[PDB]
Design a protein around this ligand. Structure first.
Ligand code: CDL
Ligand code: CDL
Ligand code: U10
Ligand code: PC1
Ligand code: PC1
Ligand code: SF4
Ligand code: SF4
Ligand code: SF4
Lengths: 155, 176, 318, 70, 55, 145, 298
């Protein structure tokens, strides 16, 4: 039946997307250091299929790791625009989540969500590299639960 | 006491210069560089098998905030507002009101995880060990609003991680 | 079944290129005390298929300032030439037994730079144009020595046909006769394939992604196809030239196994050097050759010109 | 602990194996078992053309020796 | 997570040093994750007399 | 000599994991084939192994349960599937497993360790936990006028 | 020809928010200032506040401070050299030494409870004492760290590629460096014999014995060699601190600048009152101004 065929196509495409999540080298602050430590041998992003890649044209997930300030927010929004779809935003740290320590400052965006649609909120100051890996795996399951071709079949 | 890190003049004996020319032509330190990486590939990798294998922690680890309670069942919090008055990020909001029994307990105890800095200052300030930073750190959420913790959510965390948090405090209270 | 042979020289080559990415991300990672791709199935044997699927279903945006026509013709040029230059290789019996295989492969290798050229210029970017010019300089500098070294080495072959190399190295590897040139040749194979430590056309640290910076999804995967097919073909050519192997006319499978093993070893050394060095700085990789490689290779060219004559060892042309 | 690396080469080796054998086998199949005759010079091509002519069935690989002549 | 003797010689020769003596992986030499309870000392002002804060 | 023993214990790898079928089960699920002493098991089904010979970090590990709280976890697993009592032992925060040293029991402690409830309709929605502050006049009902 | 740096792309109003927070509340700000060297920032702030308060931390607190400052110097130098090689192009030493960096993060978390932002060094000493059995682990790690340093040297020191991208690349004159406000390595790397650990010793730095790696040419290669030698000398200082740990308390025995012990707070009137006031109001610093600086790993 057509539903089974589109189901299997959904599983294949979602598996590819979740098993080759290519992130972006967009570290901003101390939350980037853990972003490096999970790339360090101990946790090693590489075994999970995730390999760092600059040039947003060839990346899927943006881990906004660090404080997002007013002077940088236009750059972050523009760079998010460069990403071809599908795209995902993982927010690392309290600063990139809702403001963190400098939530009441004059030149800090009170949450990265106000600029891009954040897909996964990873809490911490900074989050432990295990916690960030957990957030990435949660995003992976999110991609696994996508129903693109199913919705197309029931257009 | 100081040392000259790069103050070495190379010897100009015929043997020395022959060795330098051999290293230049027949790449020698380059071969050493290859050999080092060969030696480490043959070595054991350091990666752990997350999530089936977890990196080591300590009983002092700071994670998800949680409200504890006495063994009787009554909450430890008495709304003294030390944690709210000491939080560097002003992430705690407390509203108190005398309960029906008479004990002073928070009618609202909200901790904003999206604004928290996980310093642990609240758990030091608490005179009754009511608010603690639990061992949990894998509590990422898909939406922002789920990170704005209420009193009920914090009490649920306290009731859930109580087995771990009681042991962690038991193994660390003597240092404090 | 000539079509059968042509398809058998394309699909296996593409599969080998796909698994080259996995073996690179594993060998490199094990250099760096990591484990490399491990989750997808057993030992990551599905990563090439996974990211292959992603790159051909991810949205292939076209920049508003691009030049559409060349932006599209460049990936086709790159992949077509990378695949075509596999046909004259004397894997037991070459598919296309050309009388001038070496010159043909030199011509197509020189053409392959034009893919980089047109892709960089048509993308309308500062980084892309920078990378295109670095590619210009790198490939011209290294092409001069490529041609001279090929002449010097093949002077003992007697002609430019690739198959006779097997006859030439019947009793001894050619590397024992021209080990100096071989070193230089290896370095040239590192640079013409635009790999480390000469991968300045991409320059991930300083040029973000170089000439692939505006290339997304399918065209990017295709330029990667061209690059890795060129890597494997260059290592195969180096194995054919210097590290000859025994060839039983009745069982060509023995020569197939030996040749494949030598190509695998040469490629593994490519990934080895990629993970053990810093990166060159533009002019240096030029000043390395125009001032150290070119004079030495000219002298070796004169030496190998004279050598058959002084020893009465001129190889036959037939 | 690099034996996990080994499968990647293994299958890849098979990949690099597939053409080298196939062409050879094809050269044996389409030319009657024997090696494909290579014409690097006009003399070899003339020999091949005369073989095609003598064979009578218009295939050069089909060879005739003493039985053909009287 | 131990290498064979043949491998150890290859690693040692490729590096030129005894790697087995000083490894970057902690096997058993680490301190036990469970430790006896400590008794912290007191400071120099935990006196019951002549301890006026003016001084 | 060590080559032969090395080839041999690769067969103890398949023998320990309940034969070939269990060998591919653990290989495809937990991505490892290494064996270890069964330190314990929790009420949710996760199996808890330890091997002190492994270097610090992989001396203890979990094979997660196939099913927990009405959710198939044969293929998808996460770090929140660890019950609180065993999370201490797994993360090397203690050397006392719950089997030997069990955590103190109390009424308010839960009896079913819910995993990360994000995504599922059992999410957490923030809301004000306080009553009203200003009341209204609630005008009378008699027309009167 | 010209290279204008447009900083401010990460300008958090730290020096503005600090006023609105008490001295204890402002402590975590410095941990978040420099995220590769962390306990050094807290050490500088604590020294400033202690000098203003006219109090001194206990000797054990000073020794813990210098030990963890040298650990932090190890962290920062590892980051600097490894990411430097990555930017030049060599990426393997980054991972190789970041394994060790995770090993030191383990010490950070075991002592303070957080991997990165310890908030450990505080005005008056340190928060809590070292967990039992930590000196042994530090000794075990520092015993093998020399091999990793030597491997990094063998990877970068004599390579003709690294020795060409860093030799005579970015030379600075001595007087130009002094006038430009440079400090730390960029003085030590250009012949200027200056180091705050020796010239103006703070804490107990006048006890440990170490050598300052004075540079020669002032280029990038000389500064990299200086950083590696600073790593080795800091390893020596760590060995000395491990071998000379004194008994005593962890904070100044004054309940008006350091919170009382949790056992004393729940039993005695004065401890409870002082804990309440310190965690609600804080210690009143006498009026005045000071400028205190330390040889941070940068
Ligand atoms: C030599 C022959 C050159 C013939 C020629 O005019 O080529 C123009 C062609 C396109 O020029 P362009 O600067 O990319 O501008 C395209 C649009 O005008 C500007 O971009 P665009 O987005 O308008 O491109 C779409 C556009 C133009 O069509 C294309 O872009 C499709 C590809 C080119 C078709 C011609 O489509 C149409 O005009 C309608 C087509 C129906 O330029 C070439 O260099 C093509 C040469 C091909 C030679 C043979 C190669 C084998
Ligand atoms: C060059 C390659 C020559 C052929 C393979 C030689 C080989 O690796 O023999 C095994 C043996 C142990 O493997 P390894 O590469 O040393 O890594 C062992 C680690 O210590 C890690 O050892 P471990 O701590 O895991 O404990 C013992 C381990 C021992 O490892 C094995 O049993 C793997 C060996 C294959 C079974 O057993 C297992 O781990 C079993 C997992 C097997 C996974 C599948 C491996 C497929 C290999 C390629 C098959 C053909 C394609 O090799 C050696 O001791 C060196 C022999 C060199 C002979 C050169 C001849 C030319
Ligand atoms: C000082 O402060 C600093 C900060 O302070 C705040 C900072 O923030 C930052 C900034 C922060 C960062 C940069 C973050 C940190 C980043 C890192 C540490 C980087 C870590 C990187 C890694 C772990 C990964 C490195 C990568 C490696 C080792 C290898 C990569 C190589 C690859 C090959 C990857 C794979 C990619 C690709 C494209 C391959 C896949 C493609 C295929 C297989 C295609 C296959 C296709 C087929 C088979 C097709 C087949 C077709 C067939 C058969 C037929 C077709 C025909 C038809 C007709 C259809 C810095 C630097 C900083 O310094
Ligand atoms: C070899 C690869 C084999 C599998 C190829 C799968 C390719 C899938 C491409 C994406 C899905 C597009 C599709 O079929 O319908 C789009 C359908 C169209 O249905 P739709 O009405 O929801 O449109 C999507 C929303 N807009 C229009 C805004 C983009 O959408 C989706 O699948 C995503 C939702
Ligand atoms: C152009 C079109 C070309 C079309 C070609 C036809 C095939 C294309 C698709 C091939 C893969 C389809 C998907 C099924 C396999 C898959 O990805 O499963 C993922 C799923 C992922 O499950 P998962 O999501 O639970 O895995 C991750 C989570 N952990 C790690 C916790 C388990 O895995 C499996 O189904 C298990 C398969 C194990 C065996 C895999 C094959 C081993 C042998 C490979 C030999 C080399 C082949 C080359
Ligand atoms: S959330 Fe904490 S660690 Fe992350 S950038 Fe903000 S202050 Fe730094
Ligand atoms: S640990 Fe969290 S809740 Fe407690 S004071 Fe620090 S930021 Fe506030
Ligand atoms: S410090 Fe403790 S007792 Fe006081 S209000 Fe906060 S949680 Fe309640």
């Amino acid at each position: 039946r057509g539903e089974y065929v589109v189901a299997k196509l959904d599983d294949l495409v979602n598996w590819a997307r979740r098993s080759s999540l290519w992130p972006m080298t967009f570290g901003l602050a101390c939350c980037a250091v853990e972003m490096m430590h999970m790339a360090a041998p101990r946790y090693d992003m590489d075994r999970f299929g995730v390999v760092f890649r600059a040039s947003p044209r060839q990346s899927d997930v943006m881990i906004v790791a660090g404080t997002l300030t007013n002077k940088m927010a236009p750059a972050l929004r523009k760079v998010y625009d460069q990403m071809p779809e599908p795209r995902y935003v993982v927010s690392m740290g309290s600063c990139a989540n809702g403001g963190g320590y400098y939530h009441y400052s004059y030149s800090v965006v009170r949450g990265c969500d106000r600029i891009v649609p954040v897909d996964i909120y990873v809490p911490g100051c900074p989050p432990t590299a295990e916690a960030l890996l957990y957030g990435i795996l949660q995003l992976q399951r999110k991609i696994k639960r996508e129903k693109r071709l199913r919705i197309w079949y029931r257009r | 006491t100081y040392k000259f890190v790069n103050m070495r003049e190379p010897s100009m004996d015929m043997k020395s210069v022959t060795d330098r020319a051999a290293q230049t032509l027949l790449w020698t330190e380059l071969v050493r560089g290859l050999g080092m990486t060969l030696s480490y590939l043959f070595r054991e990798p350091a990666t752990i098998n997350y999530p089936f294998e977890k990196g080591p922690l300590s009983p002092r680890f700071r994670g998800e905030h949680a409200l504890r309670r006495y063994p009787s069942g009554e909450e430890r919090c008495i709304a003294c507002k030390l944690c709210e008055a000491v939080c560097p990020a002003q992430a705690i909001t407390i509203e108190a009101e005398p309960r029906a029994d008479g004990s002073r307990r928070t009618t609202r105890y909200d901790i904003d995880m999206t604004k928290c800095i996980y310093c642990g200052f609240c758990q030091e300030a608490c005179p009754v060990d009511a608010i603690v930073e639990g061992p949990n750190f894998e509590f990422s959420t898909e939406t922002h609003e789920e990170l704005l913790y209420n009193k009920e959510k914090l009490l649920n965390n306290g009731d859930k991680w109580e087995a771990e948090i009681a042991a962690n405090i038991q193994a660390d209270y003597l240092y404090r | 079944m000539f079509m059968i042979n042509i398809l058998s020289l394309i699909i296996p080559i593409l599969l080998a290129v796909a698994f080259l990415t996995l073996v690179e991300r594993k060998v490199l990672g094990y250099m760096q005390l990591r484990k490399g791709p491990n989750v997808v199935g057993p030992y990551g044997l599905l990563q090439p298929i996974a990211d292959a699927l992603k790159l051909v279903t991810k949205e292939p945006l076209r920049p508003g300032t691009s030049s559409i026509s060349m932006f599209i013709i460049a990936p086709i040029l790159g992949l077509s030439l990378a695949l075509t230059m596999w046909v004259p290789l004397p894997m037991p019996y070459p598919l296309i037994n050309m009388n001038l295989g070496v010159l043909f492969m030199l011509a197509m290798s020189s053409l392959a730079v034009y893919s980089i050229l047109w892709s960089g210029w048509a993308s309308n970017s500062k980084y892309a144009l920078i990378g295109a010019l670095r590619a210009v300089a790198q490939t011209i500098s290294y092409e001069v020595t490529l041609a001279i070294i090929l002449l010097s080495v093949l002077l003992m072959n007697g002609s430019y046909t690739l198959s006779t190399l097997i006859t030439t190295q019947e009793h001894i590897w050619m590397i024992f006769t021209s080990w100096p040139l071989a070193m230089m040749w290896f370095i040239s194979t590192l640079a013409e394939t635009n790999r480390a430590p000469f991968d300045l056309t991409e320059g991930e640290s300083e040029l973000v992604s170089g000439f692939n910076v505006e290339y997304a999804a399918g065209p990017f995967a295709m330029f990667f196809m061209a690059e890795y097919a060129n890597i494997i073909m260059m290592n195969a050519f180096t194995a054919i030239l210097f590290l000859g192997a025994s060839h039983d006319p009745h069982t060509p499978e023995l020569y197939t196994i030996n040749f494949v093993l030598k190509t695998l070893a040469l490629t593994i050394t490519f990934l080895w050097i990629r993970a053990s060095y810093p990166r060159f700085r533009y002019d240096q990789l030029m000043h390395l050759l125009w001032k150290s490689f070119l004079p030495l290779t000219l002298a070796l060219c004169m030496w190998h010109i004279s050598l058959p004559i002084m020893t009465a060892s001129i190889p036959p042309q037939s | 602990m690099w034996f996990e690396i080994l499968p990647g080469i293994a299958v890849m080796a098979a990949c690099l194996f597939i053409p080298g054998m196939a062409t050879a086998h094809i050269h044996k199949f389409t030319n009657g078992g024997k090696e494909k005759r290579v014409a690097h010079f006009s003399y070899q091509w003339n020999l091949m053309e005369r073989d095609r002519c003598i064979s009578g069935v218009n295939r050069y690989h089909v060879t005739k020796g003493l039985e053909n002549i009287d | 997570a131990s290498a064979t003797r043949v491998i150890q010689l290859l690693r040692n020769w490729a590096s030129g040093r005894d790697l087995q003596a000083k490894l970057q992986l902690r096997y058993q030499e680490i301190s036990k994750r469970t430790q006896p309870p400590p008794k912290l000392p007191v400071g120099p002002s935990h006196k019951l007399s002549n301890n006026y804060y003016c001084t | 000599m060590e080559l032969v023993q090395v080839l041999r214990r690769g067969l103890q790898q398949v023998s320990g994991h309940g034969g070939l079928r269990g060998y591919l089960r653990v290989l495809f699920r937990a991505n490892d084939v290494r064996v270890g002493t069964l330190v314990g098991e929790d009420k949710y089904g996760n199996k808890y192994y330890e091997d002190n010979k492994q270097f610090f970090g992989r001396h203890r590990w979990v094979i997660y349960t196939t099913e927990m709280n009405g959710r198939d976890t044969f293929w998808d697993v996460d770090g929140s599937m660890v019950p609180p009592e065993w999370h201490r032992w797994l993360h090397c925060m203690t050397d006392d497993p719950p089997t030997t040293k069990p955590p103190t029991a109390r009424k308010y402690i839960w009896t079913n360790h819910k995993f990360n409830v994000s995504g599922t309709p059992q999410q957490y929605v923030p809301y004000s936990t306080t009553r009203k502050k200003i009341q209204e006049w609630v005008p009378p009902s008699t027309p009167y006028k | 020809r010209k290279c204008d740096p447009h900083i401010g792309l990460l300008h958090r109003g730290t020096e503005k928010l600090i006023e609105y927070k008490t001295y204890l509340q402002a402590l975590p700000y410095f941990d978040r200032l420099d995220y590769v060297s962390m306990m050094c920032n807290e050490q500088a702030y604590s020294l400033a506040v202690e000098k203003l308060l006219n109090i001194q931390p206990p000797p054990r607190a000073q020794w813990i401070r210098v030990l963890f400052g040298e650990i932090t110097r190890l962290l920062n130098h590892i980051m600097a050299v490894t990411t430097h090689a990555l930017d030049i192009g060599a990426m393997t030493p980054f991972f190789w030494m970041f394994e060790e960096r995770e090993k030191m993060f383990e010490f950070y978390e075991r002592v303070s409870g957080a991997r990165m932002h310890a908030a450990y060094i505080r005005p008056g000493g340190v928060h809590q004492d070292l967990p039992l059995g930590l000196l042994d682990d530090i000794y075990e790690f520092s015993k093998n760290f020399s091999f990793r340093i030597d491997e990094l040297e063998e990877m970068l020191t004599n390579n003709r590629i690294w020795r060409n991208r860093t030799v005579d690349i970015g030379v600075v004159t001595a007087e130009d460096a002094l006038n430009y406000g440079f400090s730390g390595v960029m003085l030590r790397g250009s012949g200027i014999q200056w180091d705050l650990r020796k010239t103006q010793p703070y804490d107990v730095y006048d006890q440990v014995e170490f050598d300052v790696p004075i540079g020669s040419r002032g280029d990038c290669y000389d500064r990299y060699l200086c950083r590696v030698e600073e790593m080795r000398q800091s390893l020596r200082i760590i060995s000395q601190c491990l071998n000379k740990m004194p008994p005593g308390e962890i904070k100044v025995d004054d309940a008006k600048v350091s919170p009382p012990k949790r056992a004393e707070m729940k039993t005695s009137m004065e401890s409870l009152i002082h804990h309440f006031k310190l965690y609600t109001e804080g210690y009143q610093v006498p009026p005045g101004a000071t400028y205190t600086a330390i040889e941070a790993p940068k």
